[PDB]
Design a protein around this ligand. Structure first.
Ligand SMILES: Nc1ncnc2c1ncn2[C@@H]1O[C@H](COP(=O)(O)OP(=O)(O)OP(=O)(O)O)[C@@H](O)[C@H]1O
Ligand SMILES: [Ca+2]
Ligand SMILES: [Ca+2]
Lengths: 22, 361
């Protein structure tokens, strides 16, 4: 499921560090 | 091919680039005309004295599409300095945004701004994502509207969304009211801006209203001074917490509506019994009107009184609550797994504006 892969990414991708400081 | 993230609110626009940790531009959602021929955003505000202002987004909903187009054009070209045809654009919308409104946003982005791809996300959901969650109930209180949005695994549950037509603008107006009882007269548009600063700096949510009023009546320990722009210094007391108390008791401004603690409980109680514990344990605050010191503790107390005794109640109040919607959009739009979910220009051309319902939910 495509939605669950996105949800799993939102919970455990680590995106929030990965955001560039600006 | 860098995506843009535009969070359009009743009071403030937050715009920037997906992958950034902060919006590049934050400016009032206003179009001013002389009292050139129109000014948008930060022009129109610093130049306010010679302008009449219109707000294209009211109570969380776009009500003036011509001026909303100006806000978007000003966001693309003046603030972010990009050509929208070169960038996928993530837009935000209020919960329970009418179908015709979402289609009109979609048609404008594709036919007027010619974006290559776009997406419309519910603001409360992006705030939940910014907190590292995909399940929870969000209290989103902004300038024009307040919502309780239960969300299960990325899906907002529209049947259980609650709406309270009371937010920061009304609290500013109410504080203008009650400051007059102390003998201070704040009337003008410039004086409204001062009272909004008073609210944002000095107001808080009392843990128990009657105890706090008795404390305020018998001492000056809750009084705080505030320097006006002309140097004069005023002192405010129980108005500090009487102003945000309206969120919990809307009848203070004559609204026949339940306060945000009861609407939270009722929204949970409209969800499937199966998911309620997860909602109670994941109460996420978002929006500028949830910034008051003490609001989390009061919500914890009030919901504990309503919920079963064994339930675990946690209120999450992140420090970047004013910007959680935008941050959540920046995260979402920059995810590798998200890219198949953009509405492309070809999909729009083959389905019409009703593609937004199919793809955004
Ligand atoms: N520290 C604070 N304390 C209390 N209120 C605040 C604080 N900071 C901002 N606000 C209020 O938050 C409101 C703006 O918040 P936000 O940017 O989330 O609203 P919006 O997105 O423009 O509106 P909406 O979501 O209702 O369409 C303003 O009314 C402002 O006065
Ligand atoms: Ca908002
Ligand atoms: Ca005007």
């Amino acid at each position: 499921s495509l939605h669950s892969a996105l949800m799993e990414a939102i919970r455990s991708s680590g995106g929030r560090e990965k955001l560039r400081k600006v | 091919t860098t995506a843009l993230v535009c969070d359009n609110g009743s009071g403030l626009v937050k715009a920037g680039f997906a992958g950034d940790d902060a919006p590049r531009a934050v400016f009032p959602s206003i179009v001013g005309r002389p009292r050139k021929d129109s000014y948008v955003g930060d022009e129109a505000q610093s130049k306010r004295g010679i302008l009449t202002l219109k707000y294209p987004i009211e109570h969380g909903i776009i009500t003036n599409w011509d001026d909303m187009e100006k806000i978007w054009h000003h966001t693309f070209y003046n603030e972010l300095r990009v050509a929208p045809e070169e960038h996928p654009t993530l837009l935000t919308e209020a919960p329970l945004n009418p179908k015709a409104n979402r289609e009109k946003m979609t048609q404008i982005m594709f036919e007027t701004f010619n974006v290559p791809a776009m997406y419309v996300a519910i603001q409360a959901v992006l705030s939940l994502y910014a907190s590292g969650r995909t399940t929870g109930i969000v209290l989103d209180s902004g300038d024009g509207v307040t919502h309780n949005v239960p969300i299960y695994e990325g899906y907002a549950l529209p049947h259980a969304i609650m709406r309270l037509d009371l937010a920061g603008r009304d609290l500013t107006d109410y504080l203008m009211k009650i400051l007059t009882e102390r003998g201070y007269s704040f009337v003008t548009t410039a004086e409204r801006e001062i009272v909004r600063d008073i609210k944002e700096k000095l107001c808080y949510v009392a843990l128990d209203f009657e105890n706090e009023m008795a404390t305020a009546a018998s001492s000056s320990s809750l009084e705080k001074s505030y320097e006006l722009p002309d140097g004069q210094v005023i002192t405010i007391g129980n108005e500090r917490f009487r102003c945000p108390e309206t969120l919990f008791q809307p009848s203070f401004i004559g609204m026949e509506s339940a306060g945000i603690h009861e609407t939270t409980y009722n929204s949970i109680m409209k969800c499937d019994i199966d998911i309620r514990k997860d909602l109670y344990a994941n109460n996420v605050m978002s929006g500028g009107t949830t910034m008051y010191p003490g609001i989390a503790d009061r919500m914890q107390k009030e919901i504990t009184a309503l919920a079963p005794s064994t339930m675990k109640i946690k209120i999450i109040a992140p420090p970047e609550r004013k910007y959680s919607v935008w941050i959540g959009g920046s995260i979402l739009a920059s995810l590798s797994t998200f890219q198949q979910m953009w509405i492309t220009k070809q999909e729009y051309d083959e389905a019409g504006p009703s593609i937004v319902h199919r793809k955004c939910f």
